[PDB]
Write a protein that binds this ligand. Structure first.
Ligand SMILES: [Mg+2]
Lengths: 190, 190
């Protein structure tokens, strides 16, 4: 299994770090893939952390090529980061390709959940940050006020406070119960 | 109030990001202060994120000088990073200086809680990652198995899963009721 954590200028640090750290603990390969202008892959996160992404998306020639490399695509939030990711055709194309495929998985958290709406995903239910609830429900989704929603192979989640639950939900789809439980235990979930 | 978030090579990404993002949302100044030898302040985190710290600890000549710059000192975990921070004389000296001051606060999370012990702090009750429980108890602390503990002006916490609750407990000490509740409600805590 092979994970892509998308990242842009303006991506939220908390929502990035939780899935990152969970998949690393699981010993599941994960790359950060930057969508932006910086030629050095230096990202200015939402709350001003400056981080190097592993890759630029420009390295990947198409969505079909992306699908040959990765099994899980994760779209974190933060207002600016989500605006950029959600309005990038490459990201949308990956999400559309992955949706309802066997052994592919999509995660979106906070304002990142707007990517379901822009890509035209036909899931019925969704969650996202309360600040984007109206926008989601505008798009015909039925909003669920719970930390995480799974429909088909799309995981959505609300905010920085639910980033750990979100990462875990993703991991749960792809890890054995044995591995899941071991990672879970190591986290000290409250 | 100004906050110092210590960071070392090997510091956990989740435990860094939670207090970082919480204080940023609170509009309370926060600096990352690197303990390590890279001269560009580039840090390799526990799970391989590469990111710049704002300052090196070498810029600050003594714990008494640190205390004129910062009101809250935070020691995150991650196995490696905690070992470095806990064994750095400057960090011990800062912890020892801030303890019981009426206008300062200390936070430690996961294996970073070992710093209480290496600093010789005389609080009676504490928590930390369950993997360092035995070490904490050998130091004469009573270990509480819960997400966050406060005693005097020391906040300790267990692991990546408790990082948000930890950052919130720190914020609670210094924010107005109005600013705590607003930041809390923005996080979408589960
Ligand atoms: Mg140079």
């Amino acid at each position: 299994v092979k994970v892509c954590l998308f990242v842009a200028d303006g991506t939220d640090e908390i929502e990035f770090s939780a899935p990152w750290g969970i998949f690393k603990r699981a010993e599941i390969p994960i790359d950060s893939v930057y969508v932006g202008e910086n030629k050095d892959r230096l990202v200015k996160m939402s709350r001003d952390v400056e981080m190097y992404a592993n890759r630029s998306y420009k390295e990947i020639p198409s969505a079909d090529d992306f699908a040959k490399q990765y099994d899980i695509a994760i779209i974190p939030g933060g207002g600016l980061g989500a605006k950029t990711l959600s309005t990038t055709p490459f990201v949308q194309q990956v999400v559309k390709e992955f949706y309802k495929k066997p052994n592919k998985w999509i995660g979106m958290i906070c304002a990142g959940t707007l990517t379901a709406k822009t890509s035209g995903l036909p899931n019925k239910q969704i969650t996202g940050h309360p600040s984007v609830r109206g926008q989601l429900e505008e798009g015909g989704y039925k909003y669920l006020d719970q930390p995480v929603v799974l429909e088909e192979n799309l995981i959505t989640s609300q905010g920085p406070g639910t980033a750990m639950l979100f990462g875990l939900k993703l991991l749960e789809q792809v890890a054995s119960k044995d591995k899941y439980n071991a990672v879970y235990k190591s986290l000290s979930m409250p």
